Amino acid sequence: CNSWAVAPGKTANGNALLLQNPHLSWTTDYFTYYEAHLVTPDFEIYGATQIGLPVIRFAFNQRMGITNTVNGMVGATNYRLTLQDGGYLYDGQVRPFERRQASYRLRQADGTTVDKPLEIRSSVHGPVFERADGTAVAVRVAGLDRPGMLEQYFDMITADSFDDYEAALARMQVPTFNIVYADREGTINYSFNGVAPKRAEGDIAFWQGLVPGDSSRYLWTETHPLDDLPRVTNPPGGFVQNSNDPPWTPTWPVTYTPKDFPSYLAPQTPHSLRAQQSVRLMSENDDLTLERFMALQLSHRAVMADRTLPDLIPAALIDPDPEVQAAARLLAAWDREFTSDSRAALLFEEWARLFAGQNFAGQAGFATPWSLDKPVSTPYGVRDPKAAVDQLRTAIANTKRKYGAIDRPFGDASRMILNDVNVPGAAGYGNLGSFRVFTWSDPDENGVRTPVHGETWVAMIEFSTPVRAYGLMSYGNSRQPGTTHYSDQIERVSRADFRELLLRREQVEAAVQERTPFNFKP
């Protein structure tokens, strides 16, 4: 996911800008987004939300808007139990489980059901599961006493002011997510949100692993209020952002550092090249217009190539294999953009898969390591160029195996295909530096691949009066069999041709193609 909010002072017209840009699976059902517009006499909300949710999580209106990104808030603990004498060891004593006899029905191949018993055991930590390898694990989830999740979102998105928004947010009923806010009065805000247990010791990695389940030492009971969490409001730099990076460069210059917060809230790991581009694209640009904001969102730079090709290319040209030399010259002539017509991009990805792992997040290959002191210009360089050239040799073979040649156009292999619509792809993997994201699948037998994850709902809003907003939904507004509204936006996505989002009654009345009167009686 990406998120940007821009203060008035950083824009040409003097109105805040907001980007909504979540990245999730294109197929997982509960991750499907749906666009809609609700209007009553007392509120108005426009935007996207996961199907089945009755409130819009990615909302805006004439006054304000929010967006969300995944922050991985560590709101649960998995505890390793030590089993002993039919109970579990805890503070030097054996303690018996709570146990309940439940049951459920299981449908059989012939349409009937059988009754299946299900024992539910619990320790003081929580419900107990047995892993395949025999490890007994109790899971303890925070915020089970927070019934107001949906209402909190609803009050946040209909807030009459920033003060009303923050009081809603402060209820701590939404257990995770980074949340970014902007409004027509000029306020912008980033909050690292969620329900995080107060602990006395241990960093994030310790609390992400199996915590010992044999002691009250590690049994947390309380959680952090909103003002214990990383937040930024109207910073000197005039913007906030988050692209799933840890919350340590949400703006530039920064307003806090990792020492200001307990070490279990968020990782201190290298920021992804996409997250580095996010900071650069906002910080380096001033006097922003909506049009420019939208152009910057299409950024699809192979930043990883900028960090490696200067060392890789000369090293590869030393090699006696003429195919490696030719690969080197193909990469050297590349403008390092993930465009449809790029002949070098696929080959570059296959090299990066080896150099930085299959997820492209590996750090061991670089000469200069990542540092928070140079958060948007490290890591850099190739540590062992001879080894890297051997990786290129393998990647050449991999590229020909997968795609048929080392120089097949990126957009001929990378396609966006829904029903009978088939259009050329551009942009790519976030961890390679592409800001706009299409996480391409492994290729089929003809070398054709499509996005499994990436751009879904994409909207950009200027809080002028009236507001002006544009957006697209990659996979349409419907997935019901036979709908004409699954594949009808993807061609526009392939050209970055955004729809004007229509909030004013008069605009809606000009665009209407179907009218459903309804009436509700409780």
């Binding site: 059902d29 509960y30 499907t32 749906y34 809609a36 517009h37 609700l38 209007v39 009553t40 006499p41 199907i51 089945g52 949710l53 009755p54 004439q62 808030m73 709101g75 649960a76 998995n78 459920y104 299981l106 449908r107 191949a109 299946k116 299900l118 419900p127 599961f129 892993r131 395949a132 390898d133 989830v141 089970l144 019934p147 107001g148 999740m149 949906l150 257990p175 995770t176 009066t465 349409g476 507004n477 419907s478 069999p481 004409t484 509204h485 009808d488 729809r499 229509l502 809606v508 009345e509 209407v512 193609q513 179907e514 009218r515 459903t516 009167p517 309804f518 009436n519 509700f520 409780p522």
Partner: protein, 159 residues
């Protein structure tokens, strides 16, 4: 201090759908708009919504068999369906009425357009305000925050 444009004041309940299947739901009060929103989601995504609500009930195994069993065990063991009943009761009266209306919207869509609902998910209807709460509770707390994978040690790709 320039004020925003005048808010529109709906005088009847209606969805104006645009050419891309985006619903513009106008309601004369909050419950009406939530009902309209439920109707719209059922038109656009009803099959998968019903399936997911079925699972958040803890009835995946019962409705659809062994492929849904592991999720059923995860959710019953973590007490999700019952906790959703509790959370529903714990709602503020005004917001509970919005939830009831959203559910009635789904039910009404299906009642009036039964041809649009896939056979395997018809057994899920009717849905309730509590079903809505339960799916949200599953999504936030037992997909996003606490995943079956991290607890059971099935630790591999993002999905």
């Amino acid at each position: 201090p320039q004020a925003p444009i005048a808010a529109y004041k709906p005088r009847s309940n209606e969805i104006l759908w645009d050419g891309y299947g985006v619903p513009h739901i106008y309601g004369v009060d909050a419950p009406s708009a939530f009902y309209g929103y439920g109707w719209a989601q059922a038109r656009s995504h009803g099959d998968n919504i019903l399936r997911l609500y079925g699972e958040a009930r803890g009835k995946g195994a019962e409705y659809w068999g062994p492929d849904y069993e592991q999720t059923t065990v995860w959710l019953l063991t973590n007490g999700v369906p019952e906790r959703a009943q509790q959370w529903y009761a714990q709602q503020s009266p005004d917001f509970r009425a919005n939830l009831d209306a959203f559910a009635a919207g789904i039910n009404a869509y299906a009642q009036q357009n039964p041809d649009d609902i896939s056979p395997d998910v018809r057994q899920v209807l009717p849905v309730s305000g509590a079903d809505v709460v339960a799916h949200a509770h599953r999504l936030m707390n037992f997909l996003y925050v606490a995943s079956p994978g991290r607890t059971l040690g099935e630790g591999d790709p993002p999905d």
